[model samples]
Target: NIVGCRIQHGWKEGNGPVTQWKGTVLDQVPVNPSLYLIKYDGFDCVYGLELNKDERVSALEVLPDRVATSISDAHLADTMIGKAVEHMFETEDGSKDEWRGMVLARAPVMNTWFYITYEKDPVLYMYQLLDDYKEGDLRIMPSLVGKQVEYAKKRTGMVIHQVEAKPSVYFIKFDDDFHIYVYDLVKTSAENLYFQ
Candidate 1:
């Protein structure tokens, strides 16, 4: 049920309409380049990033979850869940200041709803709500199960919805509008091609 989208003109990197630049590249005029456009499936939007001549990314778009995907094979599912956690805390703090996180839960099914703290993330908040009602060291739901997105969680102050079920880690955060500070939470010895 994913929608089809691409950058405008499929250029390398630049500031332009989303359609004008297809794929991920936005502007290609810079001798060495100064920016790049990237996309992930987590976010329901498209964004861009500013890079250096060395092809190293510097600044990121304001929205990070637009394309939140876990590339690490070790914990791809957990990483995706991590994105949700990051979004939750960001909504609570009213600021995207989080950098590192840990996995909270992973669904047992794939057909889950998606929500946000802005009257959209009720499903996820349910787990936290139940955890609070039960006891400390709360656990997450194994599945959205038949949960609808219209519900609300008073404790977590979020909506209910199903989300990515693979490798379900429940915490994620970004450094800017276009990206999250994921590198900080992960430990690695291999060269990261998609993340770094």
Candidate 2:
């Protein structure tokens, strides 16, 4: 189920440095409150469907480290490695707003990014694709599309909006140290993650 897994956050209403914890995949449901369903073993300790209220998703990213840094009260962004890339464009109406419901996937592992964008201008439709940026030393993926937990190495363009809620996690190591790069994350209601 977790073939090309991706890293996601288990967030809450307020913001702060989120502790690193492990959980299991439980179930998937289709509900109004959520664009999709999330069933995990952490429903009681650290699990929830909403990653966070929909924001522009300005940036989302994660970094690998040997020494787990200490954190508390600080925004989960504190320990993130590399500088957050503020995409050259700000989400606006017209052509930009056309992708409101869209989800961006940032697969840092493959040094690429993808967009599962939805359009409401011409008609009601959605599409997805990968955005690769590994040519140079592109630090971390965009904050809105952080490091991916699992993803295909070369092939790109896929779908999960219709797939079941599977365990999407990553635990792989890199070679000669992972370099800075840009990766795409398919846009999904999966933005907000909750755990118990």
Candidate 3:
């Protein structure tokens, strides 16, 4: 099982959290069955990428039997303000999941991180764990703000913009400052209706 398998480990040259590479296990040392020689996929096995035991072959990503999924070739998707997107996730049981959210903002650093506030993200703590999201897992979603007609078969108010001050919340300002009264609840005489 050790030989002829795919493996992953930190970059030989760098030690960052994300610095890693995939390699193929060529074979075990002729005499020492414990040592395995690894020929990296990219560099094509120069001379020193071999390893003994579980150092590199320890937590191999895709096993010898399973086929690689979308996350295997995963790369960061481009983003913009207010765009609807879903965050891909893998639960502890290794189940795939989708966490929906709106594009709140971008990080000022490198491939660092961004703020993606979830729908009805529960204003409890205001901050959710990154959940390894900063990965290349964000997929864009079509705007669903078009269908829901507020009152009588839906008034023709368009989704004006998104409100970053909260999670999955947006602004829909009525035309000519006309307040379309809905169920006589919110009578805030300003300019917009908020959605979560």
The digit string of per-residue lDDT tens for model 3 on 1-196 reads 5665666665432353446666555444342344444444544111222344334333346445422222211133233445666767678999888767565543221122333445434111111124244455666666423323243324444333334443345333232222211111133322343333
Give the Cα lDDT of each candidate: 0.27, 0.24, 0.40
Best by TM-score: 3
Which pairs clash in model 3?
Answer: 149-154
TM-score of each: 0.19, 0.19, 0.28
Indicate the TM-score of model 1. 0.19
Which one wins by TM-score: 1 or 3? 3
Encode model 2's per-residue lDDT on 5-111: one tens digit a residue: 23344333347544443332222222222322222223221122323344422232332331122222123222222223222222555332112222333222222
Quick one: RMSD of model 1?
18.0
